[PDB]
Design a protein around this ligand. Structure first.
Ligand SMILES: Brc1c(Br)c(Br)c2[nH]nnc2c1Br
Lengths: 297, 258
């Protein structure tokens, strides 16, 4: 019931409403309330809300934001979530001084990969992994949030919505208009986030699809049939694309050690088939000494 | 893809038990029958064809209807409203481009208002507690299709055809789980087209054998043989299309030799 909740302040906003920090007056629990405006006419419950709720109800995991309850109070939906303190983008900004301690980057990547592997094991694609949708708390946890753009996939997948994923984090196979995309798109996004946590700036900050592709090509090389069988046959591949040489990978994220570089390169592999699964990444040598320290700020 | 094949199959096998409707619900519906349900599902097939919706969307909508009707007594004049809201919910969940609500209102020939449909949408979500990611016969079929050697488009289409027919008749298909119907549909399709049988590799994957599938297979084989005579025909018509390789024109086998 809405009665048991005391609103504190606004903490974010989406397409269909703002998000409030609130507290349960009876248990003391601090929560986030995601308001979804419904309208009696028009279209009814938005599909984004239909997907976010039904998928989140299956996804109970320490690294996925927990949906606690759904309240319908006279023509709006309130999604009651566990309260998390800030998003990863804000934390990187706050760390503009010195970087993020490597133990923390490693802890965050490992936790993100755990959450993602759980999603993928439960046939869910996230499709909008960007720092703003990754929430951190004071105990060192990081969690995937905002499942409005997610979907339950089938095996094997069929064609789903095109041009998905916030552009900077969008995978080459989406950019090149492939008929099929799968779990590997979320890994590409996490690869961009890994890079971003180290440098504190976006890896591929394009402003259009072609610009995005070209920035990727200039960093990783333009892909040919050797690196990615089928590329040249993909719907939006063009033979006029400039053919950039692949960079020394140590120059993409210069602070990265051998293991980190190895892991990043497997997350940023062109061929979706060869790109590492979240499951396989959890056992990468980069994580050999992982701990879960409290955020330094 | 390959890294999660087993995890996902395991997970869907767990969820299909959780999302199962009650086998006996129709006995407990005062005003509706298996035959009225048959009519509704047949119409839903047509709606799906009219709006070129995924087969998955059809399977989900039927799952939502049977679950809703497991909890909620419904009058005959309201059955189609339940059906329409379920198909709207299925479309929003499953489709890239779901039909607008006005299009769903229209297809009911103005029996109901937009407001009714929208109110029913919300009621159905409440009754289902938003649990819409239900495993379907379809979701298991596409996994089973990966165990063909080689892949055969007629086998796939025919299996989907048969799985779709099982949606029409609560008796007896309500008592079988999606993975079991998909098993029977896939063996039957394979046998009809190529003479092959439920592959060893799928025993390893599912733990189902021809023996465990027999009862469903016995039922499906009858439904197949009697399909031209069934009062509902929208699926046969749908599966004459080349999109589905005209598999409804294939002849069923007279015996399964099991
Ligand atoms: Br904290 C928090 C939580 Br928890 C969720 Br869930 C959000 N969804 N959008 N913005 C959100 C913020 Br801020």
């Amino acid at each position: 019931s809405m009665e048991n909740f005391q609103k504190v302040e606004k903490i974010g906003e989406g397409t269909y409403g703002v998000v409030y920090k609130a507290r349960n007056k009876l248990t003391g629990e601090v929560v986030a309330l995601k308001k979804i405006r419904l309208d009696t006419e028009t279209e009814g419950v938005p599909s984004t809300a239909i997907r976010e709720i039904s998928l989140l109800k299956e996804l109970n995991h320490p690294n996925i934001v927990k949906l606690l309850d759904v309240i319908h109070t006279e023509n709006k939906l309130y999604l009651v979530f566990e309260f998390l303190h800030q998003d990863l983008k804000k934390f990187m900004d706050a760390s503009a001084l010195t970087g993020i301690p490597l133990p923390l980057i490693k802890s965050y990547l490992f936790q993100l990969l755990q959450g993602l592997a759980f999603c993928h094991s439960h046939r869910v694609l996230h499709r909008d992994l960007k720092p703003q949708n990754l929430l951190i708390n004071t105990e060192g946890a990081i969690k995937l949030a905002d499942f409005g753009l997610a979907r339950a996939f089938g095996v094997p997948v069929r064609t789903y919505t095109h041009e998905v994923v916030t552009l900077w984090y969008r995978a080459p196979e989406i950019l090149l208009g492939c008929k099929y995309y799968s779990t590997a798109v979320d890994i590409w996004s996490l690869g961009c986030i890994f890079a971003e946590m180290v440098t504190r700036r976006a890896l591929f900050p394009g402003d259009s699809e072609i610009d995005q592709l070209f920035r990727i090509f200039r960093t990783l090389g333009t892909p040919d049939e050797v690196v990615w069988p089928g590329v040249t046959s993909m719907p939006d591949y063009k033979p006029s694309f400039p053919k950039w040489a692949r960079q020394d990978f140590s120059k993409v994220v210069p602070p990265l050690d051998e293991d980190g570089r190895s892991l990043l390169s497997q997350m940023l592999h062109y061929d979706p088939n060869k790109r590492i699964s979240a499951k396989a990444a959890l056992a990468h040598p980069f994580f050999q000494d992982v701990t879960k320290p409290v955020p330094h700020l | 893809v390959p890294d999660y094949h087993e995890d996902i199959h395991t997970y869907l096998r767990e969820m299909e038990v959780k999302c199962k409707p009650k086998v006996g619900y129709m006995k407990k519906q005062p005003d509706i029958t298996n035959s009225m349900r048959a009519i509704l599902v047949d119409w839903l097939v047509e709606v799906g064809e009219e709006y070129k919706l995924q087969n998955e969307t059809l399977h989900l909508a039927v799952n939502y209807i049977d679950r809703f009707l497991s909890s909620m007594s419904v009058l005959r004049g309201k059955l189609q409203l339940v059906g329409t809201a379920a198909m709207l919910l299925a479309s929003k969940f499953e489709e890239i481009y779901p039909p607008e609500v006005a299009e769903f209102v229209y297809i009911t020939d103005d029996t109901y208002t937009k407001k009714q449909v929208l109110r029913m949408e919300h009621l159905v979500l409440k009754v289902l507690t938003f649990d819409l990611a239900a495993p379907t016969v379809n979701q298991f079929l596409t996994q089973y299709f990966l165990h063909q050697q080689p892949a055969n488009c007629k086998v796939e289409s025919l299996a989907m055809f048969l799985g779709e027919l099982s949606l029409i008749d609560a008796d007896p298909y309500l008592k079988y789980l999606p993975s079991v119907i998909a098993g029977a549909a896939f063996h039957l399709a394979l046998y009809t087209v190529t003479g092959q049988s439920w592959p060893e590799s799928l025993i390893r994957k599912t733990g189902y054998t021809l023996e465990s599938l027999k009862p469903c297979l016995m039922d499906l084989h009858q439904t197949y043989l009697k399909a031209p005579q069934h009062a509902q025909q929208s699926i046969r018509e749908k599966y004459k299309n080349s999109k589905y390789h005209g598999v409804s024109l294939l002849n069923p086998p007279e015996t399964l030799n099991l």
